[PDB]
Amino acid sequence: VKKLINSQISLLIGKGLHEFDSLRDPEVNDFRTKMRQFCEEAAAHRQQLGWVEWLQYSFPLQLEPNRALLVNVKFEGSEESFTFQVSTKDMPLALMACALRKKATVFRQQPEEYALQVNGRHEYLYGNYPLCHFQYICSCLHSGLTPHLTMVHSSSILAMRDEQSNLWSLEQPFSIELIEGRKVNAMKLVVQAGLFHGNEMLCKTVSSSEVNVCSEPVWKQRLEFDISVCDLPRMARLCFALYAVVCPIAWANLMLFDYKDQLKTGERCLYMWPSVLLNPAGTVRGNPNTESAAALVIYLPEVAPVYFPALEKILELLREILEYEHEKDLVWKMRHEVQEHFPEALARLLLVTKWNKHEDVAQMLYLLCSWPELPVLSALELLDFSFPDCYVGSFAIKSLRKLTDDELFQYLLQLVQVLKYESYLDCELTKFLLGRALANRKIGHFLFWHLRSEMHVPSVALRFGLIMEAYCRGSTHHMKVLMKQGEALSKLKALNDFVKVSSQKTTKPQTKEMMHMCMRQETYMEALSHLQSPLDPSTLLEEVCVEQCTFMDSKMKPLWIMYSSEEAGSAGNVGIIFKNGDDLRQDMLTLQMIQLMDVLWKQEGLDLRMTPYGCLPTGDRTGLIEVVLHSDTIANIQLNKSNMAATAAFNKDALLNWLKSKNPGEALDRAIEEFTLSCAGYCVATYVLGIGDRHSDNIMIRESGQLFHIDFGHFLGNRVPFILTYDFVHVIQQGKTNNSEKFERFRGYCERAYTILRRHGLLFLHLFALMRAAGLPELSCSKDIQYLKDSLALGKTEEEALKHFRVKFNEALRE
Numbered sequence: 045v046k047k048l049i050n051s052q053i054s055l056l057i058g059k060g061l062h063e064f065d066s067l068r069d070p071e072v073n074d075f076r077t078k079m080r081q082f083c084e085e086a087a088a089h090r091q092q093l094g095w096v097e098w099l100q101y102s103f104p105l106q107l108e109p110n111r112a113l114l115v116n117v118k119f120e121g122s123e124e125s126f127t128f129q130v131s132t133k134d135m136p137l138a139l140m141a142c143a144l145r146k147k148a149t150v151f152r153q154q155p156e157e158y159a160l161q162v163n164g165r166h167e168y169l170y171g172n173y174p175l176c177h178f179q180y181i182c183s184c185l186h187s188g189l190t191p192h193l194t195m196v197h198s199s200s201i202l203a204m205r206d207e208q209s210n211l212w213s214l215e216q217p218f219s220i221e222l223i224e225g226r227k228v229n230a231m232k233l234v235v236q237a238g239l240f241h242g243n244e245m246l247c248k249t250v251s252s253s254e255v256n257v258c259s260e261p262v263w264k265q266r267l268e269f270d271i272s273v274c275d276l277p278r279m280a281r282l283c284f285a286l287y288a289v290v291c292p293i294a295w296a297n298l299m300l301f302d303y304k305d306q307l308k309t310g311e312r313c314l315y316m317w318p319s320v321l322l323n324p325a326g327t328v329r330g331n332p333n334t335e336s337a338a339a340l341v342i343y344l345p346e347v348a349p350v351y352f353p354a355l356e357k358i359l360e361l362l363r364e365i366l367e368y369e370h371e372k373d374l375v376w377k378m379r380h381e382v383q384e385h386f387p388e389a390l391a392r393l394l395l396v397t398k399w400n401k402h403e404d405v406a407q408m409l410y411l412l413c414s415w416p417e418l419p420v421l422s423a424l425e426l427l428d429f430s431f432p433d434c435y436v437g438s439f440a441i442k443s444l445r446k447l448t449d450d451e452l453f454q455y456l457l458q459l460v461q462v463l464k465y466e467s468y469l470d471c472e473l474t475k476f477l478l479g480r481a482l483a484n485r486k487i488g489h490f491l492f493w494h495l496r497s498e499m500h501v502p503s504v505a506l507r508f509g510l511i512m513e514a515y516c517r518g519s520t521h522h523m524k525v526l527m528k529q530g531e532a533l534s535k536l537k538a539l540n541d542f543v544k545v546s547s548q549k550t551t552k553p554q555t556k557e558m559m560h561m562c563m564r565q566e567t568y569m570e571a572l573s574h575l576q577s578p579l580d581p582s583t584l585l586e587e588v589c590v591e592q593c594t595f596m597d598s599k600m601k602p603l604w605i606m607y608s609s610e611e612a613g614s615a616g617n618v619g620i621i622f623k624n625g626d627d628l629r630q631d632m633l634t635l636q637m638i639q640l641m642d643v644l645w646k647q648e649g650l651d652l653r654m655t656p657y658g659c660l661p662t663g664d665r666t667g668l669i670e671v672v673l674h675s676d677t678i679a680n681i682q683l684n685k686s687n688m689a690a691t692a693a694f695n696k697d698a699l700l701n702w703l704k705s706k707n708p709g710e711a712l713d714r715a716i717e718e719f720t721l722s723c724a725g726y727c728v729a730t731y732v733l734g735i736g737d738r739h740s741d742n743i744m745i746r747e748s749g750q751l752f753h754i755d756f757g758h759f760l761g762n763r764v765p766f767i768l769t770y771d772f773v774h775v776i777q778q779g780k781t782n783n784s785e786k787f788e789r790f791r792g793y794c795e796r797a798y799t800i801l802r803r804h805g806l807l808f809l810h811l812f813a814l815m816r817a818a819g820l821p822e823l824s825c826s827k828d829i830q831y832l833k834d835s836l837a838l839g840k841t842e843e844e845a846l847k848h849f850r851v852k853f854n855e856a857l858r859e
């Protein structure tokens with residue numbers, strides 16, 4: 045009934061729906077009701093999409109950011125295949141008319157009625173783009189492999205669709221009364237309060253009296269702030285630090301206006317969070333661990349039922365050098381000049397805006413509502429917490445709406461982290477994310493896992509749980525596809541626990557055949573088979589190949605799980621790596637950032653042949669990593685074993701002999717080149733990102749020659765030199781001792797890659813800035829972000845920045 049759906053939702057999101065109701069919170073109840081209706085409405089929009097439109101929804105196109113190729117095409121019901129010779133400039137439709145024509149001239153006698161599906165993948169070829177513009181067609185073109193497509197009729201596509209159906213007056217100073225407190229430590233106690241607007245103070249901080257530490261203390265003391273009530277901005281938050289003195293203890297935050305714009309009065313009790321002192325960016329909701337949390341009771345005086353004013357009320361109420369408070373000055377009362385001729389300097393203007401005086405806010409807000417929509421880049425900036433105003437927030441979302449799904453996919457990790465800055469449940473960002481997720485099934489997929497992966501974190505468990513419930517309201521079908529994934533994940537965790545225990549008392553071979561017998565149980569085989577990969581929903585994991593599964597007998601004992609699809613061929617031969625105990629958040633950001641570099645590089649005609657493999661936290665220190673097959677570790681290669689084709693007279697030849705043995709004849713030149721581009725790319729990626737501890741065990745190489753890094757762990761120096769491994773350098777130089785020709789080719793690739801990224805330095809700064817919200821220990825300060833600015837060197841000219849890169853590069857061929 046409606047009871048099955050709720051029950052599955054509770055199971056899927058890892059928090060029982062009954063818990064939301066137990067809260068008796070009308071903000072929560074109104075979110076669940078408003079957002080439910082919102083998502084149910086998208087669902088009904090979706091179930092009457094035209095078949096091409098539904099293809100777009102469910103299998104969005106994977107495009108790259110003259111020549112002839114061999115193609116193989118069949119139909120759904122058939123087993124019979126045709127192999128054609130088409131161009132690369134040919135549209136998909138051209139391909140489809142060929143297929144249909146030979147179907148006639150084989151079965152005896154309209155392209156528009158079909159789409160092309162990659163065999164064994166939820167991925168399709170359609171639209172007026174030449175074949176080479178397709179990522180699948182491209183991967184094939186570089187691996188020598190032949191594309192395998194299936195002609196799928198609009199009437200079967202329609203089947204899939206249906207299958208998935210379902211006030212200014214108050215001029216007295218702001219003051220609170222600090223009543224009591226409720227938990228203990230070790231000395232005297234102090235409560236520091238601060239009115240904050242984002243990260244800036246609306247006035248001086250105000251402390252309290254000192255009382256003896258034990259208790260359950262009592263102040264009943266009146267804290268009054270240097271700020272009038274009528275000047276409290278909408279998004280103003282009051283922040284408390286509780287600590288000790290002759291020693292940090294707890295913090296807690298509260299909005300002065302509720303989620304209904306009403307100014308807060310009366311007494312409220314604050315269940316604090318443990319520290320290490322004021323913490324303005326911390327969540328504005330209480331600690332859910334009410335049992336053992338210090339509690340802070342305060343009283344907000346009832347200054348009359350005063351609402352924050354409607355906007356209609358609010359609206360009625362040398363300089364280019366800069367592109368000091370003798371500089372703000374001229375930005376602010378030349379504000380109109382900034383709207384006229386510098387509409388992109390909005391951020392700067394909002395920053396010199398004093399937010400502690402209401403009639404200033406109104407004049408900014410008056411300019412804001414007439415402000416021309418801004419570029420995505422600028423928009424990404426405005427989402428930062430340093431622009432806490434809810435109207436700036438809406439402007440930002442509004443300027444963000446022109447995000448393509450690819451861009452949105454690319455930035456989604458950040459946007460999701462920014463949810464932790466939000467002051468209320470119901471907000472524009474969330475509505476924006478659910479709207480986009482419901483419009484694109486891949487976005488939906490990853491929005492879900494980013495939220496799901498943090499349900500063990502109580503700061504966000506409620507917000508994130510609510511958001512997943514709403515989404516689940518929007519696609520009952522995808523919810524079940526997603527449960528399917530989580531039943532797989534649940535199994536791998538129990539499997540991994542077994543292997544960990546087993547391997548502490550048993551040889552590896554015997555634990556492996558033990559792992560296998562466990563996988564062979566009915567329960568496992570069913571749960572682990574026939575799902576979409578959480579790493580990429582267009583990858584289908586069909587039959588788990590048990591004999592090819594194993595584990596690494598290192599540390600966390602990660603699992604190696606292989607799959608096959610008797611209908612995808614070699615494209616269905618795919619693996620996933622499950623790891624439990626390590627924190628995979630660091631690696632996901634790094635590999636996301638490397639993916640972006642790769643895109644930026646490729647849009648300026650530079651392909652450094654990167655391997656940005658999937659990496660996905662799915663839970664508390666739990667996740668999946670994408671298996672890159674036909675690759676081996678440098679360390680393994682460098683072992684220089686006997687009886688191997690790669691066996692070498694000098695250790696430095698090992699890497700190259702291995703390459704020769706995998707790439708005989710004139711195949712060899714291609715692999716050196718791939719090695720060269722990919723090494724260039726990774727050297728630069730790790731330098732900019734400040735990723736040290738790079739060694740032969742966390743660098744791998746593909747039989748094609750491509751090199752790629754793994755297990756990044758940290759980034760941002762937590763100052764890393766550029767590095768150059770002589771062993772890589774001597775693959776690049778083709779085995780030859782000196783080879784400036786081939787060494788400077790590579791120097792060029794490094795420089796070109798470096799300068800290209802430099803040109804997009806603002807994008808990386810904006811993205812990393814928003815990631816501060818994620819709570820990665822490597823990404824906290826301003827000196828973390830300063831690290832990126834120096835590795836990209838944006839405080840300098842392209843000419844002299846290149847000169848600084850050359851010295852570090854040259855210092856790096858030290859070895």
Ligand SMILES: CC[C@H](Nc1ncnc2nc[nH]c12)c1nc2cccc(F)c2c(=O)n1-c1ccccc1
Nearest residue numbers: 595596602603604621657669670671672676677754
């Ligand atoms: C750490 C190196 C390596 N990591 C990776 N191997 C393949 N694709 C990857 N994608 C990300 N990390 C990728 C690895 N990771 C594993 C993880 C779990 C279970 C395992 F058996 C392995 C394993 O055997 N290797 C391995 C080692 C030496 C050669 C070949 C593969």
